[PDB]
Design an enzyme around this catalytic site. Sequence first.
Site, PDB file in Angstrom:
ATOM      1  N   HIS A 196      13.590  -3.974  -0.883  1.00  0.00           N
ATOM      2  CA  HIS A 196      12.621  -4.859  -0.243  1.00  0.00           C
ATOM      3  C   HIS A 196      13.247  -5.849   0.734  1.00  0.00           C
ATOM      4  O   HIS A 196      12.798  -5.967   1.871  1.00  0.00           O
ATOM      5  CB  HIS A 196      11.848  -5.629  -1.322  1.00  0.00           C
ATOM      6  CG  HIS A 196      10.583  -6.267  -0.835  1.00  0.00           C
ATOM      7  ND1 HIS A 196      10.555  -7.487  -0.202  1.00  0.00           N
ATOM      8  CD2 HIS A 196       9.290  -5.868  -0.936  1.00  0.00           C
ATOM      9  CE1 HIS A 196       9.309  -7.818   0.068  1.00  0.00           C
ATOM     10  NE2 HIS A 196       8.520  -6.853  -0.367  1.00  0.00           N
ATOM     11  N   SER A 210       4.160  -7.709   3.333  1.00  0.00           N
ATOM     12  CA  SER A 210       5.565  -8.090   3.256  1.00  0.00           C
ATOM     13  C   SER A 210       6.303  -7.601   4.493  1.00  0.00           C
ATOM     14  O   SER A 210       7.316  -8.169   4.884  1.00  0.00           O
ATOM     15  CB  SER A 210       6.210  -7.467   2.014  1.00  0.00           C
ATOM     16  OG  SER A 210       5.885  -8.196   0.846  1.00  0.00           O
TER      17      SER A 210
END
Length: 274
Positions: A63, A220
């Site tokens: 991520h 995100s």
Amino acid sequence: AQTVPYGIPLIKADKVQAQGFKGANVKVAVLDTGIQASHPDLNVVGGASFVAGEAYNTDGNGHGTHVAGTVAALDNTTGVLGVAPSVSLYAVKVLNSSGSGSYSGIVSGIEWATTNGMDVINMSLGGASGSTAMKQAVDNAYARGVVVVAAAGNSGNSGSTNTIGYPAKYDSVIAVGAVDSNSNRASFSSVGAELEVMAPGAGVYSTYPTNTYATLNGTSMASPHVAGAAALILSKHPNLSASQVRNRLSSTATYLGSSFYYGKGLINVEAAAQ
Ligand SMILES: [Ca+2]
């Protein structure tokens, strides 16, 4: 060969870069799961880890490395290209290998960034509940002249309910929604009064752990587009205050519909930095 994610041309970041503004001298901090600093398409200058057992320069999740890539993947002959490839990259690990972190660990990250002179803070993370300590850390970084950008959330639509998470929900923070390559809002993009701007979040290609690149979906991926834009705007007009940079972002946004689903619209960095 170097690939160019649809995200950069879509927000017009390519036009600003062509002008010669790439975010040089701007200090951006990515508050995530860390960054795979050994990645050939990334240049991490420093950072700090507030997660036990994990150094700031390793990403055991992916991520962080992906979000970091969207903001500053080097502008060379390989991989992808970031929105602000000449930005000073700082990796602030506030989440573990499982993509989770505690309020204290995050607050410490926010505080560290503010204290170490970060110009922009990216927080591709959110929780259903806020905390007064988190609210102060954010209000202060913003008041201290720091641009705070956060993913609005992936709770999508749900009747007429507010699905915006924290810290995106705090006034001192810009809540970023997601759209696809067609500029259509992504069904997972959180909705609510606090939604401010939209950015490419669907199918965005970026750097990924162990010297590679992958595609992911999520607000995100949208947030790092706005953080890279703030850095672009600043590399052109160093004299702007966080408040001004932020206003240029929502003021020159391409209207997409009701503010509840799109906020002020898709960002246009060429218009914002002009
Ligand atoms: Ca590259």
